[PDB]
């Protein structure tokens, strides 16, 4: 029911490895969205079909206040398109680069909302996000967390069901993934550990610009914290960043509940988090809907068979 013509392509938002994300206005209804446009030519050649298909199903089969919702997804003869809920506030990576550090309160707020989303994916959808990072974490117009980018998800993951695939972002990879032995939904909690370390300390817990040496630290090096950091934060970060996933906070059968119960999250009402009752400690100051203030200026300035097969059951529309 939806073609390329139906949208006004207004402003470039980003440009990943496999395609471009454009800010769009719907002609029929006037509301704004973010479109992920992917050339089939690339997808098939660069063996990305599987990820594309997992990302499509995951958006379709999820509805959470902190996951970007999919409106439509359609294909042309040559292109694949995900029409998504637009995140006005930009990436967390944007704001943290400018501010160096977030306060512990601000970190708790983002942390909780990411926990709420990841709990839902695990317990209710049997998904593991696998690719948690500052870039994949965006803010909506109010300043609530939106997790986008579902290309690296795994489906059909229940209890201690395990995976083998080496994927994610090198800086954020859990030790068990780097060891190349099986891993479960606990990799996400490692990932939460890393992003929350970044938020409260202003750096990755382990860093070298050489992937191999990077992985050396992730496997070997004992975690270290800034001397400013409070006891509750330090304990949570220690617990999330345990190298052995069976010792990790979140690593047991109780999954997300273990982290929710944690003293760092004391006084957080988890139902109120899901209902968005909590006051976002930062409000994006976007004037209009087309205000791309919080997206890196490098992007937001530019003008506009077997290689191109059909994608069975790709097209989707919501209620």
């Amino acid at each position: 029911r939806v073609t390329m013509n139906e949208f006004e392509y207004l402003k470039l938002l980003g440009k990943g490895t496999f395609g471009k994300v454009i800010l769009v206005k719907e002609k029929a209804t006037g509301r704004y969205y973010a479109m992920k446009i992917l050339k089939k030519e690339v997808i098939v050649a660069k063996d990305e079909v599987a990820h594309t298909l997992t990302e499509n199903r995951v958006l379709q089969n999820s509805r959470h206040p902190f996951l970007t919702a999919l409106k439509y997804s359609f294909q042309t003869h040559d292109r694949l398109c995900f029409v998504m809920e637009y995140a006005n506030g930009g990436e967390l990576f944007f704001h943290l680069s400018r501010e160096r550090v977030f306060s512990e309160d601000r970190a708790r707020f983002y942390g909780a909302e990411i926990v709420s989303a990841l709990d839902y994916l695990h317990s209710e959808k049997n998904v593991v996000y696998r690719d948690l990072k500052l870039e994949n974490l965006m803010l909506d117009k109010d300043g609530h967390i939106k997790i986008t980018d579902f290309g690296l998800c795994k489906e059909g993951i229940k209890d201690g069901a395990t995976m083998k695939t080496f994927c994610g972002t090198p800086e954020y990879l859990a030790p068990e993934v780097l060891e190349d032995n099986d891993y479960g939904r606990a990799v996400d909690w490692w990932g939460l550990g890393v992003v929350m370390y970044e938020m409260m300390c202003g750096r990755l817990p382990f860093y070298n610009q050489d992937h191999e040496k990077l992985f050396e630290l992730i496997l070997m090096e004992e975690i270290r914290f800034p001397r400013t950091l409070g006891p509750e934060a330090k304990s949570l970060l220690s617990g999330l960043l345990k190298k052995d996933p069976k010792q990790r906070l979140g690593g047991g059968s109780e999954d997300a509940k273990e982290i929710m119960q944690h003293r760092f999250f004391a006084g957080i009402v988890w139902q109120h988090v899901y209902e968005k009752k909590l006051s976002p400690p930062f409000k994006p100051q976007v004037t209009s809907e087309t205000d791309t203030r919080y997206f890196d200026e490098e992007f937001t300035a530019q003008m506009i068979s077997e290689r191109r097969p059909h994608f069975p059951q790709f097209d989707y529309s919501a209620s």
């Binding site: 990820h51 990072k133 290309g151």
Partner: peptide, 10 residues
Amino acid sequence: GRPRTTSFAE
């Protein structure tokens, strides 16, 4: 500031 990261799969 740290550089932007790129996701991957084997």
